[PDB]
Design a protein around this ligand. Sequence first.
Ligand SMILES: Nc1ncnc2c1ncn2[C@@H]1O[C@H](COP(=O)(O)O)[C@@H](O)[C@H]1O
Ligand SMILES: CC(C)=CCSP(=O)(O)OP(=O)(O)O
Length: 227
Amino acid sequence: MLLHLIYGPTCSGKTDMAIQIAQETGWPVVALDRVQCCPQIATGSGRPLESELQSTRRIYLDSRPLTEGILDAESAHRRLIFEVDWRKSEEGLILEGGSISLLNCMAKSPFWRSGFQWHVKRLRLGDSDAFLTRAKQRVAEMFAIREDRPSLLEELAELWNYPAARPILEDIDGYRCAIRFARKHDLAISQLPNIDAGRHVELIEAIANEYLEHALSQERDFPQWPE
Ligand SMILES: Nc1ncnc2c1ncn2[C@@H]1O[C@H](COP(=O)(O)O)[C@@H](O)[C@H]1O
Ligand SMILES: CC(C)=CCSP(=O)(O)OP(=O)(O)O
């Protein structure tokens, strides 16, 4: 089997790159992401829109309530090995994502050491300013009110109802920022999606800066995959 590994920092265009290869080849893409396995934060966690898949398939390693905690990395790694192992008859698969703890498991795992052909692509963080520009547009996309999917702020207000979701979302990019932003301005979290004209802009810029923080960590902690 051919495994087309696309990894790299947040807001690097990885997902679209993967969808395009998947349109051409017909192969599924397995999301190398733990946080995307909670569909209740589909939007904030980066899941492509159903419209954006262009009819390609995108495979998550689990589907789990947020309050069950984010999928741990060794469990996600067991799962990934299984989604690849039972498709072993197929020409190729696309593995795309930015999970730091999960890429590190793949790099320690003997499973990948043997038995596959590979095309490996590592996307890198650009200049920070260009990064923040892409980040801010991404966040505004995740903030847009559509008919077909809850916004980030809507996902957050829904879950804030459940006290056990609170600690968990405080450890997730975007959400952590949005929560801190609410307390900073004395806003109920319920209120974030009604927020004045130019406070929308502060919050977007604040999240983008949390995304770049994360992308810096990804660049530090990522494995160096051989290619
Ligand atoms: N898709 C995602 N969306 C939001 N935050 C994420 C995402 N993936 C990782 N994180 C953050 O980075 C830490 C996850 O570690 P990892 O999966 O090992 O990169 C999480 O604890 C979140 O704080
Ligand atoms: C880490 C966050 C906020 C979203 C996950 S999707 P990504 O950000 O890994 O994706 P792209 O490189 O934009 O496809």
